[PDB]
Amino acid sequence: SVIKSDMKIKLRMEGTVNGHKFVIEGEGEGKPYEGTQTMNLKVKEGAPLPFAYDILTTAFNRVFTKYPKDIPDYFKQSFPEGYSWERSMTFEDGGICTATSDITLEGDCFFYEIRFDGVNFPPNGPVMQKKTLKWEPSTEKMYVRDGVLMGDVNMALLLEGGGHYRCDFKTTYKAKKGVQLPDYHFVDHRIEILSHDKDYNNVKLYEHAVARYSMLPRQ
Amino acid sequence: SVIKSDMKIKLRMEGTVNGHKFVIEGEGEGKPYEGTQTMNLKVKEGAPLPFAYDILTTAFNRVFTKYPKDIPDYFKQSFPEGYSWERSMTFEDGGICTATSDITLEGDCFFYEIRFDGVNFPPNGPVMQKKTLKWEPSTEKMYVRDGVLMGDVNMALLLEGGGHYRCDFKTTYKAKKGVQLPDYHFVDHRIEILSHDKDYNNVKLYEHAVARYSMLPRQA
Amino acid sequence: SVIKSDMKIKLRMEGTVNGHKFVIEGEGEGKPYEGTQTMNLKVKEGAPLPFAYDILTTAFNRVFTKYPKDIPDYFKQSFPEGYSWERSMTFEDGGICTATSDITLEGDCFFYEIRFDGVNFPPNGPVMQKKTLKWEPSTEKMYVRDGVLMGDVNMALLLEGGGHYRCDFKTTYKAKKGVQLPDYHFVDHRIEILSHDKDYNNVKLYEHAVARYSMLPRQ
Amino acid sequence: VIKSDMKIKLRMEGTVNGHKFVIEGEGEGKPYEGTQTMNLKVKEGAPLPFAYDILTTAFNRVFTKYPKDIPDYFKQSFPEGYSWERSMTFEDGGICTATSDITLEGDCFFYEIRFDGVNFPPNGPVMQKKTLKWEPSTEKMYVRDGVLMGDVNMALLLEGGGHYRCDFKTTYKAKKGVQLPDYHFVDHRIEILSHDKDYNNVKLYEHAVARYSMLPRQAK
Secondary structure (H helix, E strand, O other): OOOOOEEEEEEEEEEOOOOOOEEEEEEEEEEEOEEEEEEEEEEEEOOOOOOOOOOHHHOOOOOOOOOOOOOOHHHOOOOOOOOEEEEEEEEOOOOOEEEEEEEEEEEOOEEEEEEEEEEEOOOOOOOOOOEEEEEOOOOEEEEEEEEEEEEEEEEEEEEEEOEEEEEEEEEEEEEOOOOOOOOOEEEEEEEEEEOOOOOOOOEEEEEEEEEEOOHHHHH | OOOOOOEEEEEEEEEEOEEEEEEEEEEEEEEEEEEEEEEEEEEEEEOOOOOOOOHHHOOOOOOOOOOOOOOOOOHHHHHHHOOEEEEEEEEEOEEEEEEEEHHHHEOOEEEEEEEEEEOOOOOOOOOOOOOOOEEOOOOEEEEEEEEEEEEEEEEEEEEEOEEEEEEOOOOOEOOOOOOOOOOOOEEEEEEOOOOOOOOOOOOEEEEEEEEOOOOOOOOO | OOOOOOOOEEEEEEEEEEEEEEEEEEEEEEEEEEEEEEEEEEEOOOOOOOOOHHHOOOOOOOOOOOOOOOOOOOHHHOOOOOOOEEEEEOOOOEEEEEEEEEEEEEEEEEEEEEEEEEEEEOOOOOOOOEEEEOOOOOOOOOEOOOOOEEEEEEEEEEOOOOEEEEEEEEEEEEEEOOOOOOOOOEEEEEEEEEOOOOOOOOOEEEEEEEEEOOOOOOO | OOOOOEEEEEEEEEEEEEEEEEEEEEEEEEOOOOOEEEEEEEOOOOOOOOOOOOHHHOOOOOOOEEEEEEEEHHHHHOOEEEEEEEEEOOOOEEEOOOOOOEEEOOOOEEEEEEEEEEEOOOOOOOOOOEEEEOEEEEEEEEEEEEEEEEEEEEEEEEOOOOEEEEEEEEEEOOOOOOOOOOOOEEEEEEEEEEEEEEEEEEEEEEEEEOOOOOOOOOOO
16 A cells, blocks of 8 residues: 555645735644644744634644544545545634645655635634634544535534634545545544644644444444 | 433424424333433324424433433433423525423423424425435534533434435523533434334334543543 | 405414413504505513514515516415415524414405424523614515525614624425416515514514515616 | 726636636726626636636625715725625535735726635536526625625526525725724626636626615604
8 A cells, every 4th residue: 555554744735814814834744544643833924823723723634544444444545646625614603714635645745735715703703812722522424425525523612711612614525536435434533732832833733533433333 | 319220201292394283292211321212103193294204303302311420411410300402403405493392300201392393395305205214323512502501413314315414403401400511522322213104103213322522532 | 356455464473482482463454565564463471571572573474565567476376375484594693493384364364373483592692682673674585496485585683782683584485376486586675663562562563575676787 | 096987907816626726807897886897817727617607706895886875885995995705605515715805006906816615516506517697686784893794695597497595794894994884785786798618708797786775664
């Protein structure tokens, strides 16, 4: 397989949030079969970012998901040709983001080319006022729709003070070659900022993801 | 506790779907601490129902959820006084349902007083054409909001001929007395029609639900 | 026709908002061809209502719409058999209402059988805190879908101390007999409470509605 | 600085279902009559694989006839100008975001536009180019958090008949203090006047007029 136990990552994101332009570059590595990955991210343009960094972090690759043998792995099967994804993020206060990513593989290194755009965030809301602490862990529901893979996930940002701020993700994952399609299943996630400097010009980011069916038996 | 290991259930649902009125009564039982329950449901008015029975089934009580000791159990704590819930169901093709339930307890038996209303289902869609097979198992996200408990769940009906039909649930669960509130957590579900007669006048329904935190370890 | 220049109205609404049960009865009259109507409403059960009365008022009949001769009038054509409607009301803070009505005619009097249910209104929001002043006038977009008539309208409640609270309506209108279907068009509305008592146990309600095409010429 | 006749240039860069493109435009209009025309040319990404109509409302509320009794947020904002941000939520799950920065030099506006569309179904009307036009519309304008919001229920007329719905939410952001209007309406009619194969060249027109409801107030 072209997907090895250890792989490197490189990425570039260009984007806008409430009209503010930025560029972030990243480098990292992970373990595709263990479903883990870590990245170091640097703001190259647009510093200091005027919005909560957490809204970007899920845009920074389901290759890094532990898949059981009894669920076809849409993402690992897509290589060497790779895949792209498209996502909407609908926040409960009217903010909306779109993001797209093209994921290629060269040697032992994945390359992500990412575009991110966020509009209509209230100026005194938790995103523009940087009141978020983290995303909660989540469970994404994966299902085939019109020959490609969809994932929907109810996400929540934990806020300063302990409340939550909700966002609904819908992502379409699109292999560049025919791959064996999976039945309805779940991907559990936990994404975490491990460290950052004052204005998030430098961030270390981690994610762990594991695919499964329901653990509750039938009938 | 007032919540025993084995409990009975009765219910009455009155509702409408695309203007069609119906009444369903139920009797069943469950195991609150195992998170399991079974119900037998009878259509009393509105037969034969002209829509997919599956849309009703999640309206037919989070008391029946296995809660680990390290997550406060909002539902069991609420008794004897009990609790109510309110729910919206937003389907991907424009259909919307509202449902409400008042859950009371007398001796070993719960009563659910349920109202269900669905509007704007496309006439050739899978609900009005009875093309649903089941709900998939799910994971509901539970969190406190304005002093009460909210659950959001991405639901999916498996369709005849394959494919899924999506619905987003938002539920507010409202205890009738002060209880210890939980942190953010998950409830995994699997709801199943075990058996039915041809027009779904008689249905046997089962649900299993278990609460948890994420099993993925924290690295930060 | 059976629809005269002056008609009477009687109604009963049964409903729940945030679990609170109520019944309201109404009697009024209107001028179908002018598109105007007035009703007196009385809370019979559930007084004093603990939520903004404004959320109910649009559930208290498009027969009362002035239709120009060059737009088929879906509603007037449906009588004497009549029509039913179904509506969702999606508020910007998560509140959702469903409403249904069956509209019949006996002699000179319409009868409306209404069901109304509202869920998930935030306890400190403008509906549960009774901070609404009125609905703004509106323009509903009418179009055929699956052989019946659909209406979508962006609605807004003007609030105390300023600002607006948004709600999106989707209504399906279903004639009990076949009628000539209209092309895409608009219904302009203005709904107003003319008077009320302290707790809104008694309310006098008015609406004016007029159908049109766009007034802007093609090129 | 806003004259009876003004010119326009623009550049849009964007993506729809992952497909990148660039379009440039030049046109002119009459700010006080609320009319404008532009000629648009695809510079990158030809042939566009999606319905051109989804782009056309991104290609300036300066071109709106405002009556004297409604403050004109857009014309007041110059010379400094304004930006806007928009979401377009289609009924089949497609979502677009768009942003534009509008500047003025001499007699000529420049629009710098970004447009991104995601999650359009592959056999839907957008990816299958099944749209004929947008219907005329009425946008609801209201102040929110010191800037002007507009919400509009939009509909694409389809080949064969029927409509495909999209809801727009736009935030209009002046770069200086301006007199804020009360709640009001902007009526629109946007039309492609001509185009060549694959819409490499398009002539686009819009007419827009602001108003209050002319249904008279009855309440004291």
